[PDB]
Symmetry: D2
Subunit: 157 residues, 4 copies
């Protein structure tokens, strides 16, 4: 039965709450990219051992936080050895404004998953996005999503 | 064992060759959106009965052909009844120029799959894109991709 | 003093109201892509004679309506002769749901303008998007935008 | 007569050569985001005093380098006071592979410009992209682009 990892950055702690919600649904372990865009070696090992990787980031100035992208750039290492090929991926984001820009962040997360040769799990539209504490409605859709990713990861392990 | 459908539009017949290649890899049936953006009732029934749906379209003026989008718009019908929820999706495109714009077409295809609540299969980056007859290199990567989608569709049926 | 054209498709008539609003701000003439994705020869002549072209379309299944894209595809003709090079462009969209997808439609409109070698006028974020009659708040931001495009088109004629 | 600033990040120095080329065409000053995503106070002052801002970044793992995005995120400061409203913007990118992903980087640069309420100058498609020293063909198209941005910035000052 599946091992899902939620790897996320929070600037301000709203994407932290959404990650807890997704972790709860997927019964995932949580790994935090720090304020400097760094993940511990425990995080990276967990990602290489996961059946599913769910990416979390704020949308800031129209895209994923620089801290998330620094982590994405550093996944060039697992990418060159195809360590994450065929894993199940999902994502989430949350900002203070328009789902406008949030779709851009989600679309990057899909590209990052594709670059790694993974399978992308859509919301059961592309992935959860949310307004910025946070409404229970958003936390609930987030939690359902995490359960939906774990589910695919089980079927597809 | 899985039923994959390749549903595609070709303006000029280069995306037709790429579809045959993907169909060969997935051992799929082929269904053509006509020059007016119409799919037969046989096509639509096949899509509702498929384990995997692979979308094919030219990239023209920076996006999917109008004929493909007319078909996408008409999939609002299966979308309202969630007929394609949890199906496995992939895509492909081909134009006469820059993979520039082709990524935009592929990204639409991912959105269309997400809108339907499907799972997206990346190239084993997001999906095959090709230059515009067509090189064997592109046809081969296309065929491998179709085999890779069928494979996921089998595991995940 | 500048000639702005608003060229738009409305499925259902909500993007028609938004176009009237943008036309009012820019003091533009209005040209409608019909239900079949066709523009009159009067429309096409007006576009070739405009200092500014503002594109209007619904967001449907995650992108511009097929009728808008059919028109975009047909602008391949003015594109091959570079008829619209250096013109000032803007856009707008409106749907029944998430500004999620609406950003995708706006981003296509930017690509279409770029393909034509035009200059893109942002909202004074990328262009107006709106919920779907329609709120006065949205109509007002739309009208301000049309005045802002005409303004650039005057400066930059 | 116009003041254009080229503000760029280079990982590896290929986007540095492209920036020199754009600077040459626009007769711009050059300002480098360092390896840590930091711009000097001289850079930021230059950006606030520019008639045109041209953004330069590598495409890495499917998007702008983390160092570029850290700079973009830090432009939240000029953004809150609308310091860059109505400025003329352009962009460029260069990677070792598919113009696939490069369009995504360019599209972010357009969003960043829009967020700031600027005008976007397309290649006279959206902006220059290039393969990765670098071919003279790419450097030349880049230089022409920088001249084309300065030109708009003069007209539109």
């Amino acid at each position: 039965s599946s091992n899902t990892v939620v790897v996320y950055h929070s600037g301000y702690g709203h994407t932290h709450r959404m990650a807890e919600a997704v972790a709860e649904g997927a019964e995932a372990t949580l790994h935090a990219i720090d304020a400097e865009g760094n993940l511990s070696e425990d995080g990276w090992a967990a990602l290489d051992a996961a059946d599913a990787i769910i990416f979390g980031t704020p949308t800031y100035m129209g895209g994923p936080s620089w801290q998330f992208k620094k982590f994405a750039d550093a996944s060039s290492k697992p990418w060159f050895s195809a360590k994450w090929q065929d894993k199940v991926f999902g994502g989430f984001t949350n900002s203070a404004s328009l789902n406008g820009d949030k779709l851009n962040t989600l679309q990057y997360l899909v590209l990052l998953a594709g670059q790694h040769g993974g399978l992308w799990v859509s919301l059961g539209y592309i992935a959860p996005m949310a307004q910025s504490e946070m409404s229970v409605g958003d936390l609930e859709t987030a939690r359902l999503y995490g359960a939906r990713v774990a589910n695919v990861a089980r079927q597809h392990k």
